[PDB]
Amino acid sequence: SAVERNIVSRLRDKGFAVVRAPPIPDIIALKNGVIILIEMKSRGKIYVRREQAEGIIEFARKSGGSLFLGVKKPGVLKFIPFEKLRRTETGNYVADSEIEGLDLEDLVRLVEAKISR
Amino acid sequence: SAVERNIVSRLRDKGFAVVRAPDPIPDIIALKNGVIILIEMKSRKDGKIYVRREQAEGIIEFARKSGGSLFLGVKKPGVLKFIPFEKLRRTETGNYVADSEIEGLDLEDLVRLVEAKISR
Amino acid sequence: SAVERNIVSRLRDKGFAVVRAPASGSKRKDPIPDIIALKNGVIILIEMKSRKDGKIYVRREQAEGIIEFARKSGGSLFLGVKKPGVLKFIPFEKLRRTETGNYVADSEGLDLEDLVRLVEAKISR
Amino acid sequence: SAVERNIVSRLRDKGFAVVRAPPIPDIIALKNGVIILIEMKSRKDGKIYVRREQAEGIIEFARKSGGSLFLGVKKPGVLKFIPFEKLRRTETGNYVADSEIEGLDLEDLVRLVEA
């Protein structure tokens, strides 16, 4: 709620049209035709259950947006591109919380440079 | 609300990723293959569509920042109608108006408009 | 060439396996990016181009071939500005397609550090 | 050279971005973020010899790039690729492998890539 509110406020300061989810990604941020989808996670490994993962992947696929995991850790705000997660044998999604990711400033720099995965 | 629910469900049937606003946020945000559609629910009073300045400014700003296409979703039973925001006239005071025969797009025509944009 | 050499040397200093495109290639058809830099599964592709009377022009057949190499490889394509001073890299997606299919860079891009950090932060692991 | 040209053409038919290069592998082939590296080498009585100098440089390129290293057998007919790990290192540090070590065909090289 507080981390999520801070992310929404900081994306808005950078010129994004932002909405929170009321299957649906937690944050949807839009700028100059660029769609960013954020799923908030609290972890010391990142785990996304099959049903949640499938729904957000489907929303990402349909929207044509870029999906990221928002990994909130005390003193850390890292966005992990969904494609970096490993699909387990039963369809869950995993990655180490120390995997290379983006901080907020780099994510915004990524949107402006017109770069998506 | 029932019209809004029906619009969300019908856009979902057409392959759109749809979210309802939880306000300077459009009521419906529909996304398909990189295309952004924004729908503000507005009822037709005395055959007129009348969007007050404050509401219009907030939704026009969300549309500008996002790079999305803005429409007014007609809050009516029956056949779904979507009015492109650009067909409305900005008044002297900054309000936005649509008369009686400013006919809106039906759902199929809106989807065909998105498809043409998707393929661009 | 000095700018190209400066880019190759700095990418090598950052731990990249770097290769130049052969003079025995880029034959209008099947063009190969000028610089291919690889680091533990991360592919960076740079096409060198000079600033002429303000803009940067990439001919249709050259642009199409480098876009296709980038798409097939899964690499990130950039235009390396052939100018003195600050190494500037323009993401290929920022270029606009003209009426005839040529590509133009108007007026600002990434410096070397930003390119590297952003691309590695995006696809590494 | 004809074998090298044929390898480049077949990889291109399979959707790879290929550079027939100018300590750099002869062929660098890229597909969906996957790096394949091919060093062209002749057979001598069913054996492929790689001088410690050349071997070290191509191993270093493969380590830095994160790519998979193979020896492309210079022979007519069916394309054969020997994974560099199949190279038995010698007393002097030189790398040796048998030309019939059951080296991969082109499809098996493409499959390792689609994984």
Angle between helices A104-112 and A2-13 (to 10 degrees): 40
Structure tokens at B72: 């007014």
Structure tokens at D76: 């007519």
- Contact call for C43 and D35, based on CB within 8 A: yes
- Identify which of A76, B120, B21, A100 has the alpha carbon closest to the alpha carbon of residue C117: A100
B67 touching A, CB under 8 A?
A: yes
As a whole number of angstroms, the distance between CA C122 and CA A100 comes to 8
> Strand D34-42 vs strand D68-74: parallel, antiparallel, or unpaired?
parallel
The length of chain B is 120
Structure tokens at C118: 């952003």
CB A22 within 8 A of CB B20: yes
B65 touching A, CB under 8 A?
A: yes
- At residue D48, the 3 state secondary structure works out as strand
Residue in C1, C9, C24, C124 annotated catalytic: C24
> Strand D81-83 vs strand C17-20: parallel, antiparallel, or unpaired?
unpaired
Positive or negative torsion for Cα B89, B93, B95, B99? negative
- Contact call for A62 and B21, based on CB within 8 A: no
As a whole number of angstroms, the distance between CA A55 and CA D43 comes to 54
As a whole number of angstroms, the distance between CA D16 and CA B111 comes to 36
- Contact call for B15 and A64, based on CB within 8 A: no
Binding-site residues of C for Mg(2+): 4, 34, 47
- At residue B12, the 3 state secondary structure works out as helix
Across chain B, where does the E strand assignment appear?
A: 17-20, 28-32, 35-42, 49-51, 69-74, 81-84, 89-90, 96-98, 105-106
As a whole number of angstroms, the distance between CA D67 and CA D27 comes to 12
Mutate: best of D1, D32, D35, D37, partner C, most C CBs <10 A = D35
> How many other β-carbons are positioned within 10 Å of the β-carbon of residue C87?
18
Q: Amino acid identity of B41?
A: M
For residues D101, D105, D106, D109, the Cα torsion angle rounded to the nearest 10 degrees is -50
In sequence order, which residues have a C-beta less than 8 Å from that of residue B54 and are 6 or more positions away?
none
As a whole number of angstroms, the distance between CA D103 and CA A89 comes to 30
Burial class of residue A2 in the structure, from the number of CB atoms within 10 Å of its CB (0-12 exposed, 13-18 middle, 19+ buried): exposed
Question: Quick one: which H or E segment has residue A57?
Answer: helix A50-63
As a whole number of angstroms, the distance between CA C78 and CA D87 comes to 37
What are residue C87's phi and psi, to 5 degrees? -65, 115
> How many other β-carbons are positioned within 10 Å of the β-carbon of residue C9?
11
Chains with ≥3 CB–CB distances under 8 Å to D: C
CB B70 within 8 A of CB B26: yes
As a whole number of angstroms, the distance between CA B22 and CA B39 comes to 14
Q: Which domains does chain C have, with CATH numbers?
A: 1-125 (3.40.1350.10)
- Contact call for A63 and B17, based on CB within 8 A: yes
Mutate: best of B37, B64, B65, B114, partner A, most A CBs <10 A = B65
A70 touching C, CB under 8 A?
A: no
Nearest chain D residue (CA) to C124: D33
As a whole number of angstroms, the distance between CA C18 and CA C7 comes to 10
Structure tokens at D101: 């070590």
As a whole number of angstroms, the distance between CA B58 and CA C58 comes to 40
In sequence order, which residues have a C-beta less than 8 Å from that of residue C73 and are 6 or more positions away?
C43, C45, D16, D17, D30, D31, D32, D33
As a whole number of angstroms, the distance between CA D19 and CA D6 comes to 13
- Answer yes or no: is D91 a known binding residue: no
CB B105 within 8 A of CB B81: yes
In chain D, which residue ranges form alpha helices assigned H by DSSP?
A: 2-13, 52-65, 106-114
Across chain A, where does the E strand assignment appear?
A: 17-20, 27-31, 34-41, 45-48, 66-73, 76-81, 86-87, 93-96
- Contact call for D22 and C19, based on CB within 8 A: yes
Respond yes or no: is residue C24 known to be catalytic.
yes
CB A71 within 8 A of CB A80: yes
As a whole number of angstroms, the distance between CA C11 and CA C80 comes to 13
> How many other β-carbons are positioned within 10 Å of the β-carbon of residue B75?
18
As a whole number of angstroms, the distance between CA A47 and CA C59 comes to 47
CA distance A102 to chain C (A): 6
CB D79 within 8 A of CB D106: yes
How is chain C classified by DSSP, letter by letter?
A: -HHHHHHHHHHHHTT-EEEEPPSS---SSS---SEEEEETTEEEEEEEE--BTTBEEE-HHHHHHHHHHHHHHTPEEEEEE--SSS--EEEGGGSEEPTTS-EEE----B-HHHHHHHHHHHH--
What's the number of CA atoms in the CB half-sphere (13 Å) around residue B102?
A: 19
